[PDB]
């Protein structure tokens, strides 16, 4: 019942038949559709040799997949594949048993082989990344397009504050309309909110930081300290942080009636990007000096310094997910996206982005980053910090992109550019309670 080694039996499959058998975004879907059709075709058309071969369990589809030249359980582990001659196969059949008549019965309704039917009934993986053209665009005429500007900003109440020209407009996602807050003589450069959307901290083009109320639509107060234009704003629940072109790093304690709390002038050139660390008392700073500084709290001493930039850099901020990870953008001649670690002095990544970087947005439940660009390609670049590989690139802006932000659910992202467009994409998606549920 077992064939001899020195005198193997010949299968019906011929020399060139194995040469045939072994031969191999919507594009991926079509390619997957073509491959299963080809595999099914060569499985069904062949297999008479494979049916005569094999010893137990396994399948003809497994034999074809094993030929070298959500997953269900593989039956057996044999990877013999196609072969001209077989040794083990001596013609033998199992006696008919109730399982066999059950099997031949479910086969009676099948016009194709059971193995091919199982392959087709098996579910293909529905694993794709959709980063396509925006599904919604609203109106925002006359948007500022200056390199030292950062205007749009997310709030938890589905509320966006935009500095359109010389007036502050309010866009509500829940309503889809535009509401005007106020206007002044000098143009705005930076926007921010304090608390839970109660106050709106806005920086002007002369450093005249005036806080304007949201619900009451009034100017709360009028501050000074900068002799040049503000560039960006940040805060951690009690103190606003302001950076400006005149090297001013101003922390404003909104508790006392005079918010101005401390000032820092530790940089060598103008300050353009400044995002406070909300979780820990640290600060990330930089600008056009090709120098990125990390401070502890409000002290002027730079705890960390990294100088790998080469041109005007605007994009630098902390990543909410992993602590101490600071992502820094590129320049006009630098174009290097650089990811840094605080408290360890470790360079995580440094990769050419293909264009100057101005703003960054981090996801909420995944390690996906989107970065703005300007003066080089007027586009947006997606990033994965875990594997260092771009996924998709977003373009289509008449003027450079500078302003970006993340939604509450981490799905919607907003872009700010001089093209008067707001492009919205969609990239993503205990016994105390035991006592509560006793009364119903």
């Amino acid at each position: 019942v077992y064939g001899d080694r020195y005198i193997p039996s010949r299968t019906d499959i011929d020399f060139n038949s194995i040469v045939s058998i072994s031969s191999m975004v919507e594009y991926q879907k079509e390619r997957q559709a073509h491959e299963t059709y080809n595999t099914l075709l060569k499985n069904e058309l062949f297999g008479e040799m494979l049916s005569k071969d094999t010893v137990g369990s396994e399948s003809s589809i497994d034999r074809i997949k094993n030929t070298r030249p959500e997953i269900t359980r593989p039956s057996s582990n044999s990877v013999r594949g196609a072969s001209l001659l077989t040794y083990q196969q001596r013609k033998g059949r199992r006696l008919s048993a109730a399982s066999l008549l059950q099997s031949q019965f479910f086969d009676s309704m099948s016009p194709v082989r059971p193995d091919s039917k199982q392959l087709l009934l098996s579910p293909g993986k529905q694993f794709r990344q959709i980063a396509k053209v925006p599904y919604r665009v609203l109106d925002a005429p006359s948007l500022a397009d200056d390199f030292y500007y950062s205007l749009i900003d997310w709030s938890s109440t589905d509320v966006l504050a935009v500095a359109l020209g010389k007036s502050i407009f309010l866009t509500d996602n829940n309503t889809g309309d535009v509401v005007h807050l106020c206007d002044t003589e000098n143009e705005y450069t930076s926007l921010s909110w304090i608390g839970a959307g109660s106050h709106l901290a806005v920086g002007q083009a002369n450093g005249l930081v005036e806080i304007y109320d949201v619900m009451k639509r009034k100017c709360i107060r009028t501050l000074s300290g900068h002799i040049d234009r503000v560039a960006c704003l940040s805060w951690n629940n009690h103190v606003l942080t302001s950076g400006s072109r005149d090297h001013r790093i101003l922390h404003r304690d909104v508790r006392m009636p005079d918010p101005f709390f401390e000032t820092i002038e530790s940089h060598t050139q103008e300050v353009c990007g400044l995002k406070w660390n909300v979780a820990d008392n640290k600060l990330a700073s930089g600008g056009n000096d090709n120098v990125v500084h990390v401070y502890e709290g409000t002290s002027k001493s730079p705890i960390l310094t990294f100088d790998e930039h080469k041109a005007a850099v605007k994009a630098m901020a902390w990543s909410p997910h992993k602590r101490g990870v600071l992502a820094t953008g590129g320049g006009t001649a630098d174009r290097r996206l650089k990811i840094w670690n605080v408290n360890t002095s470790i360079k995580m990544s440094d990769i050419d982005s293909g264009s100057q970087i101005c703003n960054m947005v981090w996801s909420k439940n995944t390690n996906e980053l989107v970065t703005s660009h300007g003066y080089s390609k007027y586009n947006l670049t997606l990033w994965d910090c875990n594997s260092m590989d771009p996924i998709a690139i977003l373009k289509g802006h008449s003027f450079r992109v500078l302003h970006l932000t993340l939604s509450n659910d981490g799905t919607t992202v907003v872009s700010g550019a001089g093209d008067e467009t707001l492009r919205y994409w969609k990239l993503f998606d205990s016994l105390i309670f035991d006592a509560f549920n006793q009364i119903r």
């Binding site: 919604r136 665009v137 609203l138 109106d139 289509g396 467009t421």
Partner: peptide, 6 residues
Amino acid sequence: LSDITN
């Protein structure tokens, strides 16, 4: 407004 022209 959508309907962005080339």
